[PDB]
Amino acid sequence: YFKLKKLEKEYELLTLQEDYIKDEQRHLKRELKRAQEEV
Amino acid sequence: EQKIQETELKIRSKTENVRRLEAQRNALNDKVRFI
Amino acid sequence: TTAAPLLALLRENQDSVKTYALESINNVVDQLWSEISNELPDIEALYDDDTFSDREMAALIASKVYYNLGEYESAVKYALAAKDRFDIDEKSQFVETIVSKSIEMYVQEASKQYTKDEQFYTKDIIDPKLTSIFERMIEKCLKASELKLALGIALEGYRLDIIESALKSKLDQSTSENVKIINYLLTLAITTVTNSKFRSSILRKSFDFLMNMPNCDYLTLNKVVVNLNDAGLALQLFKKLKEENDEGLSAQIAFDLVSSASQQLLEILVTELTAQGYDPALLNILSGLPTCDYYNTFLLNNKNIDIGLLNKSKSSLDGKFSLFHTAVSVANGFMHAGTTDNSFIKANLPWLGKAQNWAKFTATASLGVIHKGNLLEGKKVMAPYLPGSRASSRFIKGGSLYGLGLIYAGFGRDTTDYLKNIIVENSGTSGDEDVDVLLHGASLGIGLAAMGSANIEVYEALKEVLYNDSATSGEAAALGMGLCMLGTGKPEAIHDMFTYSQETQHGNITRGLAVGLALINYGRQELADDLITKMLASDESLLRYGGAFTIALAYAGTGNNSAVKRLLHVAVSDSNDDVRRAAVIALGFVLLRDYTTVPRIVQLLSKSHNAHVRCGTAFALGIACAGKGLQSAIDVLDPLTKDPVDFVRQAAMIALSMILIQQTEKLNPQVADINKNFLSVITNKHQEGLAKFGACVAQGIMNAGGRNVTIQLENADTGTLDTKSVVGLVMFSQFWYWFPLAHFLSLSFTPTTVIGIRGSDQAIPKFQMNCYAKEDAFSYPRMKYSSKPYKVDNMTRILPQQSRYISFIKDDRFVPVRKFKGNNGVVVLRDREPKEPVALIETVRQMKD
Numbered sequence: 033y034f035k036l037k038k039l040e041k042e043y044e045l046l047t048l049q050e051d052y053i054k055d056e057q058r059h060l061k062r063e064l065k066r067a068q069e070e071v
Numbered sequence: 072e073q074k075i076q077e078t079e080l081k082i083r084s085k086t087e088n089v090r091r092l093e094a095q096r097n098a099l100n101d102k103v104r105f106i
Numbered sequence: 107t108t109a110a111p112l113l114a115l116l117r118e119n120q121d122s123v124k125t126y127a128l129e130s131i132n133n134v135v136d137q138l139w140s141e142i143s144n145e146l147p148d149i150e151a152l153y154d155d156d157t158f159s160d161r162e163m164a165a166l167i168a169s170k171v172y173y174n175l176g177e178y179e180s181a182v183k184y185a186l187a188a189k190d191r192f193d194i195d196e197k198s199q200f201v202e203t204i205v206s207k208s209i210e211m212y213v214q215e216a217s218k219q220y221t222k223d224e225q226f227y228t229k230d231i232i233d234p235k236l237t238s239i240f241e242r243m244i245e246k247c248l249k250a251s252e253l254k255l256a257l258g259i260a261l262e263g264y265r266l267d268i269i270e271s272a273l274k275s276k277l278d279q280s281t282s283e284n285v286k287i288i289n290y291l292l293t294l295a296i297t298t299v300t301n302s303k304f305r306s307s308i309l310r311k312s313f314d315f316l317m318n319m320p321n322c323d324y325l326t327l328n329k330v331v332v333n334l335n336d337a338g339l340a341l342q343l344f345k346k347l348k349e350e351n352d353e354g355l356s357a358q359i360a361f362d363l364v365s366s367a368s369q370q371l372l373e374i375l376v377t378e379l380t381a382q383g384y385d386p387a388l389l390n391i392l393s394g395l396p397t398c399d400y401y402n403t404f405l406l407n408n409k410n411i412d413i414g415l416l417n418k419s420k421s422s423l424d425g426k427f428s429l430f431h432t433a434v435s436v437a438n439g440f441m442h443a444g445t446t447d448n449s450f451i452k453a454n455l456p457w458l459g460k461a462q463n464w465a466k467f468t469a470t471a472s473l474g475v476i477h478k479g480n481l482l483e484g485k486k487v488m489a490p491y492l493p494g495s496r497a498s499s500r501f502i503k504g505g506s507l508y509g510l511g512l513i514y515a516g517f518g519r520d521t522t523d524y525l526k527n528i529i530v531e532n533s534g535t536s537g538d539e540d541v542d543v544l545l546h547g548a549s550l551g552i553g554l555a556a557m558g559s560a561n562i563e564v565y566e567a568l569k570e571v572l573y574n575d576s577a578t579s580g581e582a583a584a585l586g587m588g589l590c591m592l593g594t595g596k597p598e599a600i601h602d603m604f605t606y607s608q609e610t611q612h613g614n615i616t617r618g619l620a621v622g623l624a625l626i627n628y629g630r631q632e633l634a635d636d637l638i639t640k641m642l643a644s645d646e647s648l649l650r651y652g653g654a655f656t657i658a659l660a661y662a663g664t665g666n667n668s669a670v671k672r673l674l675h676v677a678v679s680d681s682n683d684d685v686r687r688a689a690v691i692a693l694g695f696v697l698l699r700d701y702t703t704v705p706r707i708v709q710l711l712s713k714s715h716n717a718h719v720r721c722g723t724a725f726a727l728g729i730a731c732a733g734k735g736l737q738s739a740i741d742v743l744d745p746l747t748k749d750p751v752d753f754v755r756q757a758a759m760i761a762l763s764m765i766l767i768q769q770t771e772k773l774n775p776q777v778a779d780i781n782k783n784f785l786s787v788i789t790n791k792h793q794e795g796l797a798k799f800g801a802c803v804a805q806g807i808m809n810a811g812g813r814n815v816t817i818q819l820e821n822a823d824t825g826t827l828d829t830k831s832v833v834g835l836v837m838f839s840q841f842w843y844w845f846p847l848a849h850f851l852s853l854s855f856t857p858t859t860v861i862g863i864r865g866s867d868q869a870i871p872k873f874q875m876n877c878y879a880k881e882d883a884f885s886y887p888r889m890k891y892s893s894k895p896y897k898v899d900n901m902t903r904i905l906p907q908q909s910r911y912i913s914f915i916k917d918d919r920f921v922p923v924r925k926f927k928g929n930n931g932v933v934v935l936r937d938r939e940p941k942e943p944v945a946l947i948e949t950v951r952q953m954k955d
Contacts, residue, residue, distance in 0.1 A: 033254060033290070039079055040297070041700045046085050047667045048674055048707060049092055055678045056095045063102040070106065072255065074206035096710070103715045 107134055109167065113145035116152070128163050135170040142171055153187060162188040173200065178207040186238050194242050208239040209259055216264035220301060227265040244268055248275065257290055261298045270311050285323040288312045292329055297664050297699075309334055319346055324355065328362050329825050337374045341382055348385065354865040354936045360391040361932040366825045369516055369558025370593065394481065394517050396868055399951040400931065401479040403870055404859045405444040406950065408902045409812025410886045416441075418785055419802045420457060426795070428465035431457070432846045433799040437806030439472035443852055444811055446477045448487070463501035463540075464845060467547075470502055474509030475852040480954055484513040493528060493544075500540035508547035511554030512852055515830065518555020525552040526567055532579075533570045542579035545571065549579060553586030558829055561590050565599065575610055581618035581844075588625030592829060595626045600637060607649070614844070620652030625833070627660050634660045642676070650676070650685040655836050658692035663820070663827050669696050677711070677719065687722035691839055694726035695832060698820040701734040705742045712742065717751040722839075724754065728761030729835055732817040735907060739765055740776045753842065755793070756800030759783070760838075763804035767816045768905060771885050780804075781887060796842065803848065813886060813903050815855035823856075823929050830854070858930045859901040860912075862920040864944075865937035868951055871944045875899035877912045906930060919944050 107130040116124065135142075149168045152158040165188035172180035181204045185192050194201055215236065219226045226232055240263055247256040253276070260268035269291065278284060291308055299305040309330040316322050331340040340363075347356040363375060375392040390396065420434035434457065438450045451458060451469060458469055470491065477487050491497045491506035507525060514521050528548045536542050549568055556564055564586065571583040584603070591599060603626070607619040623641075627634035634656060641653030654676060661669035670693065677689035690711055697704050708723035724746050731739045743765075746758040762780055770777040784805040788798040818824065819831045830853035837850040863869045876895035882903040883896075891911055899912065906928070914922045914935075921938040 036075060036258070039075070039082065041702060042082050043667075044665055044670070044697065044700050044703045045706060046082070046089070047670050049089050049710075050085075051671050051674055052710065053092050053095065055674065056092075056099050058678065060095070060099060060102065063099070063106060066106050067102070073202060074209070077206075096713070100713050103713065106715060 107131070108138070108141065109134055110141035110145055113142065113148045116148055125160060125163075128160055128167065131167050132163070135167055136174075139171050139174045142167075143175065146171065162190050164188075166191045170200065173204070178203065179211070182208045182211070182239070183235055186235050189238065194239065194246055205239050205243050208236055209243070209263065212236040212240050213262045213264070216262075217300060220264060220304070224303070227263075227267055240265075244272070248272055253287060253290070257287075258294060258298075261291070261295050264299070264301065264304055266304070266307055266311070269308055273311075273315065279320060281321055284315065285326065288316075288323070288326050292326070306334060310339070313339055313342075317342075317346065319350060324359050325362065328359060328366065332363070332366050332368070332371060332825065335368065335371050335374075337378055340371070340374055341379060344379070344385065344388065347388075353387070354934075356385070356388055357391065357865075357934050358932065358936075360388045361397065361934060362929065364392050364394060364397050365823070365931045368593065368829065372516065373559065395955055396951075397931075398479040398481055398517070399868065399949075399954055400859075400933075401444040401857065402446065402954055403949040403951050404857045404901060405811045405814055406446075407870075408814070409441070409445055410809070411441040411812065412809060412887045414889055415784060415805070415887060419788055419805065422788060424456070424460040426799075428462060428468070428845070429795070429799050429842070431461045431465045432468040432848075433802040435468040435472045436475075436846065436848050437803045439475035439852070440803075440806035440810035440855070441812060442476040443815065443855060444476075444479050444857070446480065446487075448473065448476070450476075463499060466499075466502035467505040467508070468846065468849070470505030471508050471512070471849045474512030475849060477509075478513045478515075478852055480513055481517055482954055484510065500538075501543050504540070504543035504545070504547035506547065507544070507551040508849070509551075511547075511551035512849065515554040515557055515853065521555050522552065522561070522564075525555065526564060529567050529571065533567060535574060536576065536579070539578065542576050545576075545579040546582045549582035549586040553582075553589040556586075557589040557833075558592045559590060560593075560596065564590055565596075572606060572610075572615070575612060575615060577612065577614055580612065581614035584615070584618035584622035585625075588622035589833070591622075591626035592628045592833075594630070595628070600626055604637065604640065616646070616648045617651065620648045621655070621836070624652045624656040624659060624836075627656055628829075629662075629827075630660045631666070638672075647682050647684065650680060650682065651688050654685070654688040654692035655695075655839075658695035658836070659832065662695045662698060662832065665696050665699055677722075683716050683718035686716060687718035688839060690719060690722035691726045691729075694729040695835075698730050698827070701730040702736055704730050705736065705739040709742050712746065717749065717754050720746055720749060721751070721754045721757045724757040724761045725838065728764035729819065732764035732767065733819065733821055733907070737765070737769060737774045737776075740774065744776075750794070752794035752796040755787075755797035756841070759787075759797070759800040759804040760807070763807035764817055767808055768813075768882055768903060768907065771881055773880065809887065810855055811857055813882075814857045814859075816858060816906070817854045818856050819854060823931055828854070856931055858904060858906040859933060860899065860904065860909075860926075860928070860930065861901050861933050862918075862935035862937060863933060865940045868949075869944070869946050870949050870951075871946045873900055873918060873944060875912075875915055875918075877915070879905045879909065879912050 109131040112127040112131060115127070146168065149164055152164065153161050158164075165184055169181060169185040169192075172184060185204055194205070212232075215232055216226070219231050223229065223231050227237075240259075244256050244260065256268065256272060273287065276287065291312065295305045295308055299308075313327060313330055316327055327343055331343065343359065347359065364372065367375065372392070376389075379389070379392065416438070420438075423430060435450065442450070450472060461469055470488075473487050477484055480487070485492070488506035488509055489495065491503050493503075497503040507528065510521055510525065511518070518525075525548055529545055529552065532541060532545045536545075549571070552564055568583040568587050571579060574580070576583070587599070587603070600623070603619055603622055607616050607623075610616070623637060627637060638653060638656055641649045641656070644650070654673060657669050657673055673689045673693045673696075677686040680686060690708070693707070694704065697707070704727060708727045711723045712720055714720065724743060727739055727742060740762060743758050743761055746754055749755060749758075762776075766774065766777055766780055783801055787793045787801040790798075817831070819828055819835075834850040834853040837847040840847050860875070861870060862873075863871075874897065876897075877899050878892060878894050879896055879899065881896065882905055883898055885903070904912075909926070909928055912926050914926050916922055919937060919939045919942050921936050923936050927935070
């Protein structure tokens with residue numbers, strides 16, 4: 033019965049990493065903003 | 072038991088999309104160390 | 107035979123020929139489905155015709171067409187239209203997919219039709235097309251002797267008839283089949299059934315089959331009365347123990363309930379049980395007298411504090427204000443916790459005198475951690491600092507009222523009226539600063555004793571203190587009210603305490619109310635979303651600091667995909683580092699169920715430009731990974747130690763001490779590097795000031811309780827989320843911002859011991875089980891399955907994580923029951939020969955009794 037439990041535990045990684053992709057893109061926009069300020 | 076095995080297909084399908092996240096993370100860490 | 111022209115001839119006469127025409131179609135349904143696709147509307151149009159009697163054979167034709175076209179929805183309807191030709195017993199991929207498709211659409215309408223009626227599974231409320239396969243599939247799995255697909259689908263389809271009816275026919279009372287069958291119903295239904303009332307009826311059905319008690323599982327019935335918190339089923343279990351008289355069976359039930367029960371259920375097992383009748387032998391057990399003795403007696407037998415390495419830490423300097431005196435006093439209280447050793451205060455004079463007014467709080471509150479578990483002489487420890495005996499100063503006097511909260515927490519009903527009258531006298535006003543310090547420890551003291559229990563008197567008593575807008579005692583007043591509002595709480599107090607936050611703009615007050623608004627909502631899940639929305643919309647730093655922990659407390663236990671997405675956006679969009687730190691710490695409380703994916707999530711957030719983000723993910727990693735496995739979480743904390751930031755190193759050292767408990771002796775390679783850092787960071791001047799302060803505290807966490815107690819949160823011994831353990835970890839997030847709160851961490855330390863005691867009363871003898879385990883027993887800080895027995899397996903440190911390999915020998919005066927039950931906070935195994943030369947040793951338990 034461990035096959036069913038091991039699968040549901042892997043969706044916890046898939047849950048956060050879907051919205052975490054766009055978080056890096058929004059962070060990249062802040063890094064490019066700070067990059068122009070450092071110059 | 073094929074209904075549960077079909078749900079497992081999403082894990083291997085989204086795994087390829089997770090690998091795209093690793094591309095932007097290394098590019099982001101280069102910007103963090105730069106600033 | 108070809109179905110295309112035959113369905114086009116349906117407009118002619120002689121319907122008898124059409125019967126033989128439909129018979130030849132059943133052969134080509136699996137061959138060519140392309141030519142029949144255009145003639146499909148002729149089949150459905152004749153189904154509603156009352157003069158068309160061939161719908162039985164016509165349903166078989168359309169069932170195998172729409173399915174092959176790629177539409178799984180129509181395959182269910184056209185197959186069951188006749189309710190005859192459909193054969194579920196035939197082995198094919200055509201039926202099995204329709205079964206999985208019908209169940210997929212049945213579980214969706216099960217929760218939607220629950221609002222209209224709860225009997226929908228016994229009635230026609232659901233369209234019978236979705237209930238025909240769902241009923242016949244379970245009956246087919248019952249004949250195949252497979253309970254995995256029968257019980258798993260039943261929990262998803264929201265049908266109580268399957269659990270009740272099928273369990274009677276599967277009875278196997280070898281006496282070991284009915285125990286496991288119900289076990290799958292308790293674990294799966296928590297992560298599957300959304301409705302709290304449907305899963306509540308499931309626990310009530312298992313009580314009837316186990317009511318006769320034919321040497322069945324007594325642990326299953328314990329988890330039923332704790333989750334339901336029903337006074338009817340709780341007191342009914344004790345009534346069965348009166349008919350069948352066993353002193354070893356009734357004890358193991360009583361010691362297990364008092365540990366796993368919430369605050370509201372403990373009052374039912376004591377106050378409510380007395381009114382309806384009780385057992386004089388089982389009444390003192392539920393009152394916590396032998397339970398608190400387990401904390402005092404087990405830890406006192408074997409305790410190694412390693413004074414050699416402890417003296418070098420606290421003898422370095424008398425300075426650094428209260429930051430040094432706290433690190434040495436709180437870490438020392440870890441090793442002596444439960445053993446009632448005052449040697450730090452008594453045997454060592456100088457370390458007490460060097461403390462300032464605010465620094466004497468940790469020296470006094472350390473006794474509350476050391477003497478925790480004393481229901482009799484605990485007041486005598488604070489006797490010189492109690493009110494009416496005065497003190498050397500009123501600043502240290504306030505710490506005595508806080509020490510009573512740590513010792514008596516949850517049992518402090520006797521101290522409820524004692525701590526309340528002190529607040530009422532000072533509730534009017536205050537003319538001095540130290541007067542608020544006296545009420546500061548009183549508010550936190552009355553909050554811990556009444557923690558989990560709703561009390562309107564304490565709430566109204568602390569409400570008047572908030573009106574005075576006190577800078578010191580005003581923060582503890584909100585913390586004392588939040589502990590009484592745990593669980594369901596009072597809905598009116600939600601908006602009242604939230605209104606006072608906007609009206610009164612005080613540093614400590616608003617931050618204290620923010621934590622109080624987090625504690626008032628506990629386990630409410632979506633019911634707390636009204637308060638969460640108000641905090642996320644506000645730009646206040648303190649409202650967003652407590653908004654993360656509000657999600658952590660209500661959404662804990664079973665993980666929620668919505669709570670993860672909420673806490674993720676808070677640590678990104680918001681630029682406040684304290685809120686980003688509080689958001690990543692709140693994520694660990696939702697992930698308590700799965701500890702394997704925690705290191706992978708915190709490692710992604712461990713790379714950023716902010717130090718507070720790395721500081722929060724450090725301690726949040728050690729929360730779930732403390733009492734669990736997966737040693738690789740230490741490698742994630744390795745780059746966090748090299749961080750020049752001071753508070754990142756301190757949170758990393760504390761996180762290392764939580765995961766590395768009992769990881770020595772050829773288990774983890776990182777136990778050698780952490781033992782050197784004990785005296786290395788303190789003596790080194792290159793390190794951070796706060797880095798060496800937490801390294802001394804981390805040194806005492808692994809050796810806490812004499813290298814015995816460990817931090818257990820969401821484990822098999824408790825059975826549910828520990829209320830005392832989850833709150834103590836939230837208070838740790840605030841350390842140097844106000845004054846160290848680490849005293850609240852003592853609630854999460856429980857000892858690990860395995861002993862049989864006797865079959866009647868308390869003994870604690872000395873014996874040897876001689877089983878296979880790694881050697882933690884003789885391992886102390888200095889200056890594969892081999893079936894190999896070990897010297898002393900009794901009590902001490904042992905190895906509770908890998909203990910599943912530890913057996914139990916039947917050659918002694920005891921007898922095996924659960925085959926190493928493994929519960930440390932209960933023990934007291936079955937003794938088949940009481941009052942025998944088991945080499946009994948009388949402990950100090952009579953002092954606390």
